[PDB]
Amino acid sequence: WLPLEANPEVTNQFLKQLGLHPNWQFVDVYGMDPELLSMVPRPVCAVLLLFPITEKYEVFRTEEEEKIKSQGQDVTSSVYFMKQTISNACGTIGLIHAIANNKDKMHFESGSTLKKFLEESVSMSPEERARYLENYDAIRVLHFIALVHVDGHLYELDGRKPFPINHGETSDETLLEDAIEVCKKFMERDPLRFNAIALSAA
Ligand SMILES: Cc1c(O)c(C)c2c(c1O)C(=O)C[C@@H](c1ccc(O)cc1)O2
């Protein structure tokens, strides 16, 4: 599985292995301050956020799950969501969430293994996607989540949760800034360090 660190060079090597043309490359997001965001090449189509699992995460996510089940949320049918059943798989799952939800922006090489995996898993349930990932030997190389734009909304994709989380309106053009605002919200949940990479045009 992808190592549990925010490392663009390793993640881009993985993208190449998986058969993606390198006109999208991960970059570091050096921090949330606007002059740091300006160093991220645009467009951006995904942000991966790395953070440690804490007791606060477990308590908050339980509250959030109850809230969403009670109020409902909009998760459009186009969102690709894969459950996590193996801890150390969260980096690889993050990468899959980033590519699956941006498939039409991507250029896949002929025998691309990730292209194959995506075509075969587009109609699977999140649970089936987890099982297939476990089976799929060609995908072989403290928590990661993905932030993407789908159909006008900003989705958080965390395979430890039961579903995507809708964080409000966004667009392809404003995804980086809107994702960073969601990261600021996340960090308010715990009285840490910011560690993120962005999938950027190259
Ligand atoms: C339920 C829930 C989450 O879903 C997420 C993403 C969280 C938290 C949480 O409770 C936190 O409490 C800490 C947090 C975090 C994010 C960025 C960072 O640099 C350091 C910490 O992220």
Author numbering: 6 to 146, 168 to 217, 220 to 230
Would you copy out the relevant sentences from the publication that reported this structure?
The deubiquitinase UCHL3 is a member of the ubiquitin carboxyl-terminal hydrolase (UCH) family, and it plays important roles in murine fertilization and preimplantation development. In response to DNA damage, UCHL3 is phosphorylated and activated by ATM, and activated UCHL3 positively regulates HR by deubiquitinating RAD51 to promote the BRCA2-RAD51 interaction. Here, we find that the deubiquitinase UCHL3 is the direct target of farrerol. Mechanistically, farrerol enhanced the deubiquitinase activity of UCHL3 to promote RAD51 deubiquitination, thereby improving HR repair.
To elucidate how farrerol specifically binds to UCHL3, we crystallized UCHL3 in the presence of farrerol and determined the structure of the complex at 1.58 Å. The phenolic hydroxyl of farrerol formed hydrogen bonds with two amino acid residues, Lys187 and Arg215, in UCHL3. Here, using LiP-small molecule mapping (LiP-SMap) and surface plasmon resonance (SPR) assays, we identify UCHL3 as the direct target protein of farrerol, and the data revealed the strong affinity of farrerol for UCHL3 (Kd = 36.73 nM). We created two UCHL3 mutants, UCHL3–K187A and UCHL3–R215A, and then incubated farrerol with HEK293 cells that contained exogenously-introduced vectors in which UCHL3–K187A or UCHL3–R215A was expressed. In contrast to the UCHL3 WT, an improvement in thermal stability was not observed for the two mutants, indicating that farrerol directly binds to UCHL3 through the two amino acid residues. Further SPR assay with the purified recombinant UCHL3–K187A R215A mutant protein and farrerol confirmed that mutating the two amino acid sites abolished the binding of farrerol to UCHL3. Since the cocrystal structure of the UCHL3–farrerol complex revealed that farrerol directly binds to UCHL3, a ubiquitin–AMC assay was then performed to determine whether farrerol activates UCHL3 enzymatic activity, and we found that farrerol affected both Km and Kcat, by slightly increasing Km from 47.72 to 56.27 nM and significantly increasing Kcat from 11.99 to 19.64 s−1, suggesting that farrerol activates UCHL3 deubiquitinase activity. The in vitro deubiquitination assay revealed that farrerol promoted the UCHL3-mediated deubiquitination of RAD51 in a dose-dependent manner. Since we demonstrated that farrerol binds to UCHL3 through two amino acid residues to activate its enzymatic activity, in order to treat HR-overactivated cancer or overcome radio/chemo-resistance, it is likely worthwhile to try generating farrerol derivatives that exhibit an inhibitory effect on UCHL3 while still retaining a high affinity to UCHL3.
